[PDB]
């Protein structure tokens, strides 16, 4: 399928199909195919793919917590080279947030 890697496209997809679009791969899988983060070679070893799907630990506790709730994150607006500061955060009960400032602040988008 065509790459879906925008906040709205990914958010719609997450809530509609309850999974990430096909162009997302976790850090481990990316590493299993050759990704070396400081080389910024993800597009080389995994064309059209973005890092996403890993557990997000909400270390600073800015996203809302709840008994039974875990979070996951995915890279947004990524194509190739070194990673950026844009992420989409989606929970097990399908709450969607984003950040555009490397996890300093968050906005509820769903």
């Amino acid at each position: 399928a065509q790459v879906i890697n925008t906040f709205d496209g990914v958010a719609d997809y997450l809530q509609t199909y309850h999974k990430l679009p096909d162009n997302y791969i976790t850090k481990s899988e990316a590493q299993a195919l050759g990704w070396v983060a400081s080389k910024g070679n993800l597009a080389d070893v995994a064309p059209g793919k973005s890092i996403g799907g890993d557990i997000f630990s909400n270390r600073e506790g800015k996203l809302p917590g709840k008994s039974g709730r875990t979070w996951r994150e995915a890279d947004i607006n990524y194509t190739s080279g070194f990673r950026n500061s844009d992420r989409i955060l989606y929970s097990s009960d399908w709450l969607i947030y984003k950040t555009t400032d490397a996890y300093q602040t968050f906005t509820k988008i769903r």
């Binding site: 850090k27 400081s38 996890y103």
Partner: protein, 90 residues
């Protein structure tokens, strides 16, 4: 191989700690300076293998509140995750 040094006695705030990490780990220009950005950099940016040498840990704990400990925990979880990180505490 990357080596990062923290001179604990020179840390006067949590801000100093993230700024010392930005420089020593060659973090992004807009490094978020939070625990969430730290994790994301250790598992999706930083070069490995990595040796983090944290000198004067106790002193650096006095003016970061829980910070120092929180940041060390992130490095430790990154090493639990599979990152090739060697932590030296003195």
């Amino acid at each position: 191989m990357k080596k990062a040094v923290i001179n604990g006695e020179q840390i006067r705030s949590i801000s100093d700690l993230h700024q010392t990490l930005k420089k020593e780990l060659a973090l992004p220009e807009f490094y978020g300076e939070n625990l969430d950005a730290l994790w994301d950099c250790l598992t999706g940016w930083v070069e490995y293998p990595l040796v983090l040498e944290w000198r004067q840990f106790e002193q650096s704990k006095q003016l970061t509140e829980n910070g120092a400990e929180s940041v060390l925990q992130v490095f430790r979880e990154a090493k639990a995750e599979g990152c090739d990180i060697t932590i030296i505490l003195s």
